[PDB]
With several copies, the nearest count.
Chain A
Amino acid sequence: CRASEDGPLNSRAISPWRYELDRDLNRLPQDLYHARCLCPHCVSLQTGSHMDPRGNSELLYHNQTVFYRRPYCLERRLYRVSLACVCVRPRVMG
Protein backbone atom coordinates (compact mmCIF):
# COMPACT_ATOMS: atom_id res chain seq x y z
CA CYS A 1 0.00 0.00 0.00
CA ARG A 2 2.52 2.57 -1.23
CA ALA A 3 3.21 4.81 -4.23
CA SER A 4 6.60 4.82 -5.97
CA GLU A 5 8.02 7.31 -8.50
CA ASP A 6 9.10 5.35 -11.59
CA GLY A 7 5.69 3.72 -11.95
CA PRO A 8 4.35 2.84 -14.26
CA LEU A 9 1.07 4.49 -13.16
CA ASN A 10 0.23 1.49 -10.96
CA SER A 11 2.65 2.35 -8.17
CA ARG A 12 2.13 6.07 -8.87
CA ALA A 13 -1.60 6.55 -8.20
CA ILE A 14 -3.09 7.70 -4.91
CA SER A 15 -4.98 4.39 -4.52
CA PRO A 16 -2.66 1.80 -6.08
CA TRP A 17 -3.70 -1.63 -7.32
CA ARG A 18 -1.98 -4.93 -8.09
CA TYR A 19 -2.58 -7.23 -11.05
CA GLU A 20 -3.85 -10.72 -10.22
CA LEU A 21 -3.94 -13.81 -12.42
CA ASP A 22 -6.95 -15.62 -13.93
CA ARG A 23 -6.06 -18.71 -15.97
CA ASP A 24 -8.18 -20.88 -18.27
CA LEU A 25 -7.36 -23.64 -20.76
CA ASN A 26 -9.76 -22.56 -23.52
CA ARG A 27 -9.47 -18.73 -23.58
CA LEU A 28 -7.62 -16.18 -25.69
CA PRO A 29 -5.51 -14.77 -24.13
CA GLN A 30 -4.48 -17.65 -21.87
CA ASP A 31 -3.45 -15.22 -19.11
CA LEU A 32 -5.74 -12.35 -18.11
CA TYR A 33 -4.91 -9.82 -15.41
CA HIS A 34 -7.77 -8.05 -13.66
CA ALA A 35 -7.27 -4.94 -11.56
CA ARG A 36 -7.45 -5.49 -7.79
CA CYS A 37 -7.41 -2.40 -5.57
CA LEU A 38 -4.79 -2.91 -2.87
CA CYS A 39 -5.02 0.17 -0.64
CA PRO A 40 -8.41 0.23 1.14
CA HIS A 41 -8.25 4.04 1.17
CA CYS A 42 -6.37 6.66 -0.82
CA VAL A 43 -2.90 7.78 0.31
CA SER A 44 -1.77 11.27 1.25
CA LEU A 45 0.09 13.24 -1.41
CA GLN A 46 2.23 14.69 1.40
CA THR A 47 4.21 11.43 1.52
CA GLY A 48 2.65 8.93 -0.87
CA SER A 49 3.53 6.10 1.51
CA HIS A 50 0.64 5.77 3.99
CA MET A 51 -3.12 5.80 3.52
CA ASP A 52 -5.80 8.28 4.62
CA PRO A 53 -9.49 7.39 5.04
CA ARG A 54 -10.93 10.55 3.41
CA GLY A 55 -11.39 8.82 0.04
CA ASN A 56 -12.87 5.62 -1.34
CA SER A 57 -11.39 2.89 -3.54
CA GLU A 58 -13.95 2.02 -6.21
CA LEU A 59 -13.25 -0.32 -9.09
CA LEU A 60 -14.16 0.42 -12.69
CA TYR A 61 -15.24 -2.18 -15.23
CA HIS A 62 -15.47 -2.59 -18.99
CA ASN A 63 -16.50 -5.48 -21.25
CA GLN A 64 -13.67 -7.21 -23.13
CA THR A 65 -14.02 -9.40 -26.22
CA VAL A 66 -12.92 -13.00 -25.61
CA PHE A 67 -13.12 -16.23 -27.60
CA TYR A 68 -14.16 -19.51 -25.96
CA ARG A 69 -13.41 -22.97 -27.38
CA ARG A 70 -16.63 -24.49 -26.07
CA PRO A 71 -17.24 -28.07 -27.42
CA TYR A 72 -14.38 -27.96 -31.69
CA CYS A 73 -16.37 -24.72 -31.82
CA LEU A 74 -15.48 -21.12 -31.06
CA GLU A 75 -17.63 -18.83 -28.92
CA ARG A 76 -17.87 -15.04 -28.62
CA ARG A 77 -19.23 -13.65 -25.35
CA LEU A 78 -18.59 -10.40 -23.50
CA TYR A 79 -16.16 -10.74 -20.60
CA ARG A 80 -15.73 -8.72 -17.41
CA VAL A 81 -12.26 -7.33 -16.69
CA SER A 82 -11.67 -4.54 -14.18
CA LEU A 83 -9.43 -1.93 -15.80
CA ALA A 84 -8.36 0.34 -12.93
CA CYS A 85 -9.39 1.85 -9.61
CA VAL A 86 -10.36 5.49 -9.04
CA CYS A 87 -10.55 7.60 -5.89
CA VAL A 88 -14.17 8.74 -5.59
CA ARG A 89 -15.63 11.03 -2.98
CA PRO A 90 -18.03 9.39 -0.51
CA ARG A 91 -21.83 9.45 -0.39
CA VAL A 92 -23.29 10.75 2.87
CA MET A 93 -27.01 10.48 3.65
CA GLY A 94 -28.86 12.68 6.16
Chain B
Amino acid sequence: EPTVQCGSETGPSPEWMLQHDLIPGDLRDLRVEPVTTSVYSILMNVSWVLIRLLKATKICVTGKSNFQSYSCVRCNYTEAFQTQTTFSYIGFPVELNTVYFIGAHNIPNANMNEDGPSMSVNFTSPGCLDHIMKYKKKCVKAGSLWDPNITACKKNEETVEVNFTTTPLGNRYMALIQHSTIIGFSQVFEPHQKKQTRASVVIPVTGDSEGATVQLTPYFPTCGSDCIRHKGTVVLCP
Protein backbone atom coordinates (compact mmCIF):
# COMPACT_ATOMS: atom_id res chain seq x y z
CA GLU B 1 0.00 0.00 0.00
CA PRO B 2 2.35 2.75 -1.21
CA THR B 3 1.69 6.49 -1.25
CA VAL B 4 3.45 9.57 -2.61
CA GLN B 5 5.50 11.82 -0.33
CA CYS B 6 7.82 14.20 -2.22
CA GLY B 7 10.48 16.73 -1.11
CA SER B 8 13.34 18.89 -2.39
CA GLU B 9 17.07 18.31 -2.88
CA THR B 10 19.39 19.66 -5.59
CA GLY B 11 22.97 18.55 -6.11
CA PRO B 12 24.64 15.21 -5.43
CA SER B 13 22.51 12.40 -4.03
CA PRO B 14 24.03 10.01 -1.44
CA GLU B 15 23.52 6.94 -3.66
CA TRP B 16 25.12 8.55 -6.73
CA MET B 17 28.61 8.13 -5.28
CA LEU B 18 27.97 4.79 -3.55
CA GLN B 19 28.05 1.47 -5.42
CA HIS B 20 25.36 -1.21 -5.56
CA ASP B 21 25.83 -4.91 -6.32
CA LEU B 22 22.25 -5.24 -7.60
CA ILE B 23 20.39 -2.54 -9.52
CA PRO B 24 16.64 -1.89 -9.88
CA GLY B 25 14.99 -1.71 -13.29
CA ASP B 26 13.81 1.59 -14.75
CA LEU B 27 10.68 3.68 -15.12
CA ARG B 28 8.84 2.04 -18.02
CA ASP B 29 6.78 5.15 -18.81
CA LEU B 30 6.78 8.81 -17.85
CA ARG B 31 4.42 11.69 -18.59
CA VAL B 32 4.08 15.39 -17.77
CA GLU B 33 1.10 17.72 -18.06
CA PRO B 34 0.39 21.33 -17.05
CA VAL B 35 -2.35 21.70 -14.41
CA THR B 36 -3.43 25.13 -13.16
CA THR B 37 -4.58 25.54 -9.56
CA SER B 38 -7.65 27.67 -8.92
CA VAL B 39 -7.05 31.14 -7.49
CA TYR B 40 -2.67 32.89 -10.71
CA SER B 41 -0.21 30.13 -9.84
CA ILE B 42 1.02 27.19 -11.93
CA LEU B 43 2.50 23.88 -10.79
CA MET B 44 3.88 21.05 -12.92
CA ASN B 45 2.28 17.60 -12.89
CA VAL B 46 4.58 14.57 -13.17
CA SER B 47 2.84 11.21 -13.60
CA TRP B 48 4.71 8.04 -14.52
CA VAL B 49 3.76 4.38 -14.95
CA LEU B 50 6.29 1.88 -13.63
CA ILE B 51 11.21 -4.12 -8.92
CA ARG B 52 11.08 -5.80 -5.52
CA LEU B 53 14.33 -4.05 -4.53
CA LEU B 54 13.63 -0.36 -5.16
CA LYS B 55 14.05 2.72 -3.00
CA ALA B 56 12.94 6.04 -4.52
CA THR B 57 12.86 8.15 -7.62
CA LYS B 58 14.43 11.54 -8.47
CA ILE B 59 13.16 14.25 -10.82
CA CYS B 60 15.34 17.11 -12.09
CA VAL B 61 14.01 19.96 -14.24
CA THR B 62 16.17 22.50 -16.08
CA GLY B 63 15.03 25.85 -17.46
CA LYS B 64 16.99 27.80 -20.06
CA SER B 65 15.42 31.07 -21.19
CA ASN B 66 17.43 34.33 -21.01
CA PHE B 67 18.52 33.03 -17.58
CA GLN B 68 19.82 29.93 -15.82
CA SER B 69 17.65 27.87 -13.49
CA TYR B 70 17.98 24.37 -12.08
CA SER B 71 15.81 22.52 -9.56
CA CYS B 72 15.41 18.89 -8.51
CA VAL B 73 12.85 16.93 -6.35
CA ARG B 74 13.12 13.33 -5.01
CA CYS B 75 9.95 11.39 -4.16
CA ASN B 76 10.45 8.45 -1.77
CA TYR B 77 8.43 5.20 -1.58
CA THR B 78 6.64 4.26 1.66
CA GLU B 79 6.65 0.46 1.32
CA ALA B 80 7.09 -2.27 -1.27
CA PHE B 81 4.41 -2.79 -3.93
CA GLN B 82 4.28 -6.37 -5.20
CA THR B 83 0.70 -6.16 -6.45
CA GLN B 84 -0.03 -5.36 -10.08
CA THR B 85 -3.28 -3.80 -8.83
CA THR B 86 1.14 4.45 -11.60
CA PHE B 87 1.62 7.60 -9.53
CA SER B 88 1.66 11.38 -9.89
CA TYR B 89 3.08 14.48 -8.22
CA ILE B 90 2.63 18.27 -8.16
CA GLY B 91 5.98 19.83 -7.30
CA PHE B 92 7.49 22.45 -9.63
CA PRO B 93 6.72 26.18 -9.99
CA VAL B 94 6.63 27.12 -13.66
CA GLU B 95 7.82 30.54 -14.83
CA LEU B 96 6.76 32.35 -18.02
CA ASN B 97 8.53 31.76 -21.33
CA THR B 98 10.78 28.92 -20.11
CA VAL B 99 11.64 25.65 -21.85
CA TYR B 100 11.87 22.66 -19.51
CA PHE B 101 13.99 19.53 -19.92
CA ILE B 102 12.81 17.00 -17.34
CA GLY B 103 14.28 13.56 -16.69
CA ALA B 104 13.92 10.93 -13.96
CA HIS B 105 15.98 7.91 -12.91
CA ASN B 106 15.46 5.22 -10.30
CA ILE B 107 17.72 5.02 -7.24
CA PRO B 108 20.06 3.21 -7.20
CA ASN B 109 20.89 3.55 -10.90
CA ALA B 110 23.28 1.82 -13.30
CA ASN B 111 26.81 1.48 -11.98
CA MET B 112 29.61 3.36 -13.73
CA ASN B 113 31.25 1.67 -16.73
CA GLU B 114 27.87 0.23 -17.71
CA ASP B 115 24.98 1.30 -19.95
CA GLY B 116 21.20 1.63 -19.90
CA PRO B 117 20.50 5.34 -19.41
CA SER B 118 17.10 6.83 -18.67
CA MET B 119 14.58 8.61 -20.88
CA SER B 120 13.15 12.12 -20.73
CA VAL B 121 10.09 14.06 -21.87
CA ASN B 122 9.95 17.69 -22.96
CA PHE B 123 7.46 20.55 -22.73
CA THR B 124 7.37 24.30 -23.32
CA SER B 125 5.59 26.62 -20.90
CA PRO B 126 2.83 28.91 -22.23
CA GLY B 127 3.84 32.48 -22.95
CA CYS B 128 2.33 35.80 -21.95
CA LEU B 129 0.53 36.28 -25.30
CA ASP B 130 -2.32 33.91 -24.38
CA HIS B 131 -5.57 34.60 -22.53
CA ILE B 132 -5.12 32.03 -19.75
CA MET B 133 -1.92 33.55 -18.27
CA LYS B 134 -2.51 37.20 -19.22
CA TYR B 135 -3.48 38.14 -15.63
CA LYS B 136 -0.07 37.31 -14.13
CA LYS B 137 1.71 39.82 -11.90
CA LYS B 138 4.47 40.34 -14.47
CA CYS B 139 2.23 40.52 -17.54
CA VAL B 140 -0.22 43.21 -16.38
CA LYS B 141 2.62 45.43 -15.15
CA ALA B 142 4.34 44.79 -18.49
CA GLY B 143 1.23 45.93 -20.40
CA SER B 144 -0.91 42.83 -21.02
CA LEU B 145 -4.20 44.38 -19.82
CA TRP B 146 -3.68 47.86 -21.30
CA ASP B 147 -5.86 48.59 -24.34
CA PRO B 148 -4.25 51.35 -26.45
CA ASN B 149 -7.13 51.47 -28.98
CA ILE B 150 -4.88 52.94 -31.67
CA THR B 151 -6.64 55.18 -34.21
CA ALA B 152 -3.99 56.62 -36.56
CA CYS B 153 -5.09 58.99 -39.33
CA LYS B 154 -2.89 59.80 -42.32
CA LYS B 155 -2.91 63.60 -42.61
CA ASN B 156 -1.07 63.74 -45.95
CA GLU B 157 1.77 62.12 -47.88
CA GLU B 158 4.47 63.47 -45.55
CA THR B 159 2.76 63.55 -42.13
CA VAL B 160 0.78 60.97 -40.14
CA GLU B 161 -1.31 61.82 -37.07
CA VAL B 162 -1.63 59.03 -34.49
CA ASN B 163 -4.20 58.84 -31.69
CA PHE B 164 -3.64 56.44 -28.80
CA THR B 165 -5.00 56.23 -25.27
CA THR B 166 -2.36 56.80 -22.60
CA THR B 167 -1.75 55.12 -19.24
CA PRO B 168 -0.33 56.32 -15.91
CA LEU B 169 2.58 53.88 -16.27
CA GLY B 170 4.49 55.63 -19.05
CA ASN B 171 5.18 59.10 -20.41
CA ARG B 172 7.39 58.51 -23.48
CA TYR B 173 6.61 56.18 -26.39
CA MET B 174 8.34 54.74 -29.44
CA ALA B 175 6.84 54.82 -32.93
CA LEU B 176 7.44 52.55 -35.91
CA ILE B 177 5.91 52.40 -39.41
CA GLN B 178 6.91 49.30 -41.40
CA HIS B 179 5.42 48.26 -44.74
CA SER B 180 8.48 47.08 -46.67
CA THR B 181 11.28 49.17 -45.13
CA ILE B 182 11.51 51.83 -42.42
CA ILE B 183 9.78 55.04 -43.47
CA GLY B 184 8.84 56.39 -40.05
CA PHE B 185 10.78 56.69 -36.79
CA SER B 186 10.09 59.21 -34.03
CA GLN B 187 10.33 59.69 -30.27
CA VAL B 188 7.82 61.64 -28.20
CA PHE B 189 7.17 62.70 -24.61
CA GLU B 190 3.71 63.29 -23.13
CA PRO B 191 2.64 64.15 -19.57
CA HIS B 192 -0.26 62.09 -18.25
CA GLN B 193 -3.48 64.00 -17.59
CA LYS B 194 -6.56 62.68 -15.81
CA LYS B 195 -8.84 65.16 -17.59
CA GLN B 196 -7.63 64.23 -21.09
CA THR B 197 -6.35 60.75 -21.90
CA ARG B 198 -5.80 60.75 -25.67
CA ALA B 199 -2.57 61.56 -27.48
CA SER B 200 -1.77 63.29 -30.79
CA VAL B 201 1.60 62.56 -32.43
CA VAL B 202 2.80 64.02 -35.74
CA ILE B 203 5.57 62.07 -37.48
CA PRO B 204 7.18 62.76 -40.87
CA VAL B 205 7.25 59.83 -43.29
CA THR B 206 9.29 59.25 -46.45
CA GLY B 207 7.22 57.75 -49.27
CA ASP B 208 3.62 56.65 -49.55
CA SER B 209 2.46 55.27 -46.20
CA GLU B 210 -1.04 54.26 -47.33
CA GLY B 211 -1.98 50.83 -46.03
CA ALA B 212 1.13 50.55 -43.85
CA THR B 213 1.42 48.96 -40.41
CA VAL B 214 1.63 51.06 -37.24
CA GLN B 215 3.55 49.51 -34.34
CA LEU B 216 3.44 51.07 -30.87
CA THR B 217 6.19 50.38 -28.34
CA PRO B 218 5.87 52.07 -24.93
CA TYR B 219 8.79 52.98 -22.69
CA PHE B 220 7.67 51.46 -19.43
CA PRO B 221 10.57 51.51 -16.92
CA THR B 222 9.62 48.06 -15.56
CA CYS B 223 10.05 46.27 -18.92
CA GLY B 224 12.95 48.18 -20.49
CA SER B 225 13.11 48.46 -24.27
CA ASP B 226 11.84 44.93 -25.06
CA CYS B 227 8.28 45.73 -23.97
CA ILE B 228 5.09 44.29 -25.44
CA ARG B 229 3.76 45.84 -28.65
CA HIS B 230 0.31 46.55 -30.09
CA LYS B 231 -0.85 46.41 -33.69
CA GLY B 232 -2.01 49.38 -35.71
CA THR B 233 -2.85 50.05 -39.34
CA VAL B 234 -3.03 53.26 -41.34
CA VAL B 235 -6.67 54.37 -41.25
CA LEU B 236 -7.57 57.18 -43.64
CA CYS B 237 -9.67 59.78 -41.83
CA PRO B 238 -11.87 62.36 -43.65
Contact = CB atoms under 8 A, between A and B. Distances in A.
A61 B66 contact: yes
B178 interface: yes
Interface residues of A, number: 42
A29 B71 CA distance: 11
Contacts of B66: 8-9, 58-61
A29 B65 contact: no
Interface of A (DSSP majority class): loop
A10 B103 CA distance: 21
B109 to A, nearest CB: 8
Given A69-B16, A69-B112, A31 B120 contact: yes
Interface in A12-51: 19, 21, 23, 25-26, 28-31, 33, 40-41, 46
A62 B99 contact: no
A3 B114 CA distance: 41
The bracket for how many chain B residues form the interface is 35 or more
Contacts of A93: 129, 144, 228-231
B174 A9 contact: no
Contacts of B12: 28, 67, 74
Contact of A53 (B17, B114, B144, B176): B176
Contacts of A41: 225
Interface string B80-124: 000000000000000001110101010001101010011010000
A31 B225 contact: no
A49 to B, nearest CB: 15
A53 B65 CA distance: 24
Contacts of A8: 65-66, 97-99, 127
A29 B174 contact: no
A28 B10 CA distance: 10
Given A25-B114, A29-B70, A30-B103, A6 B64 contact: no
Contacts of B17: 69, 72-74
